[PDB]
Every structure is written in C-alpha cells, then in structure tokens.
C-alpha cells in the first residue's frame, strides 16, 4: 500500500500505520528512519 513518508503499511491490518508508534522500538521500519 501507498503510505506517506511518516507512515508505513501493515498488511495484517491492511492500513498505513504512523511511524511514531514504532519509534520507541529498537527495530522500527527502515522507511520510518527519517521520521524517527
């Protein structure tokens, strides 16, 4: 799915998810690096 740079696609929920939700994790999506 097409998400803006601040989001990433989760295919279980089939939705763009905010990167901010993943920033505290040691392992955020690679595309969330810029935002986080």
């Amino acid at each position, epitope marked *: 799915g097409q998400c803006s740079q601040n989001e990433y696609f*989760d*295919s*279980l*929920l*089939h*939705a*763009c*998810i905010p990167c901010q*939700l*993943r920033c505290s*994790s*040691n*392992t955020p*999506p690679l595309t969330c690096q810029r935002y986080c």
Partner: antibody, heavy 120, light 108 residues
Framework: QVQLQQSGGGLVQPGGSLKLSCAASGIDFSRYWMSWVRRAPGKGLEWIGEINPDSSTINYAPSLKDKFIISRDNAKNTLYLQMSKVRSEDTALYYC?????????????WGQGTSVTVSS | DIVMTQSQRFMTTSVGDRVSVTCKASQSVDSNVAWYQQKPRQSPKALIF???LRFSGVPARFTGSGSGTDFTLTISNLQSEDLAEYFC?????????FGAGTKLELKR
C-alpha cells in the same frame, strides 16, 4: 455494540457441504478485510483465509484452497465460508474476524464461533 | 510456507511473575508478526501486531519485541486471567501461518 454473529454449521457427513455465515453490525463492514480461522480438537489455531472489501483479493491456506470458498455480501454485511468435500480434519470451531486500523486505533473483532462436526 | 516455531508448548509460571513466550520464524519476516490469546471455549483475541504494537484495549503488561526471525511476547506481572494459550503468527508471506501455541500454567 459490535457484533459478528455466526450461524450455519453443525453436523455434516464426510464428502458433504456446509455454508457458514458471519453477519457484522456496529462497524462499517464494507471498509474492512475479513478473515476466517479455525481450531480443531487437539490442534492449534489454523488460518483459513481472508477476503478484501470488494472481493477482488482472496487468499487461502493452501490445503484448503480447493475445498473452501470465502465470499462476502456487503449489502448484507455478511461474510461466508463455503465448505465442501469435508473430512474428519474439518471438525472444528470456526471463527470469523475483522482485523483493521481505523480512527487511529488497531481493532480486532471476532464471531462467537461456529462448531462443525464431520462424521457418519 | 513459513514455519513459526514456539519451542515451548507449555510454560510454567506464577501470578505476579514476568513471562516471555518465544517464537522463531523459519525465514525472515521483518516485523510482520502478530500474537493472539485464546482460552478454552472462547474466541481468540488479538494482542500484538507489527511485532511490538498492541491492539486497542490490550493491557500495557503485554509487550512484544523482535524483528527478522526471533520474536517474544512478554507479560509483566502476570494475572490469573492471563493464564491461557498464546500463538504467534507471521503475515510477511501468504499464507499467514500460526505457531503451534504456548499454554501457560501455574507452578506448584
């Protein structure tokens, strides 16, 4: 209140067919992907498949792709599982689910479950 | 098809303790991992998606971690109501596949 109401299972003989129903209310059914999973006696959870909102994408567990047909009727807010050529392995509790992300939250809703027993 | 291995079919624990359930993917699944809870005679409940993110309504004592092949569901301060069976799942590749399940029980 959200309710996935399941109906339509029960007893069937080997080789037979059964159509399970999962009727949704309290959510915009038409926006979301819908899933089927089952739990057979002595086995863990088994994914059966999932169908997108407009039914153009349907994915199945490979062992079930030629026995089971997943469909939906958004005008009735209902998800179906059509079972055929059933066998003892298909005796199980069948659950429908909707997993989605909307209004800023990740949501999961489940039907109450439908028992199927395949037997002579 | 990706195999999700929960090496511990049972885990012994105590109310109040921290418990971690492991799950190992047969090949890399990035962070595309979910965890579910199921009790006898009840529908499953989704706990975690994206390896570390809770579904709405899931208590903060449930956390998830991992990326690649090794994933862990942790319950801090276990409550009696947390005694149940836990399943990991990968959704990196269709078909989605479940692990075999880890049932918690109490030490005595």
């Amino acid at each position: 209140q959200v309710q996935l109401q399941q109906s339509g299972g029960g007893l069937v003989q080997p080789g037979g067919s059964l159509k399970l129903s999962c009727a949704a209310s309290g959510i915009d059914f038409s926006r979301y992907w819908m899933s089927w999973v089952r739990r057979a006696p002595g086995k863990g959870l088994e994914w059966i498949g999932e169908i997108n909102p407009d039914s153009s994408t349907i994915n199945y567990a490979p062992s079930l792709k030629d026995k089971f047909i997943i469909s939906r009727d958004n005008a009735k807010n209902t998800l179906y599982l059509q079972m055929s050529k059933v066998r003892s392995e298909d005796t199980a509790l069948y659950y429908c689910a909707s997993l989605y992300y909307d209004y800023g939250d990740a949501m999961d809703y489940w039907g109450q479950g439908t028992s199927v027993t395949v037997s002579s | 098809d990706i195999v999700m291995t929960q090496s511990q079919r049972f885990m012994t624990t105590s109310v109040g303790d921290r418990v971690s359930v492991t799950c190992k993917a047969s090949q890399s699944v990035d962070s595309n991992v979910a965890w579910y809870q199921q009790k006898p005679r009840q529908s499953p409940k989704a706990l975690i998606f994206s390896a570390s993110l809770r579904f709405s309504g899931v208590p903060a004592r449930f956390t998830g971690s991992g990326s690649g092949t090794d994933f862990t569901l942790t319950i801090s301060n276990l409550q009696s109501e947390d005694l149940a069976e836990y399943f990991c799942q990968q959704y990196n590749n269709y078909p989605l596949t479940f692990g075999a399940g880890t049932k918690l029980e109490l030490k005595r």
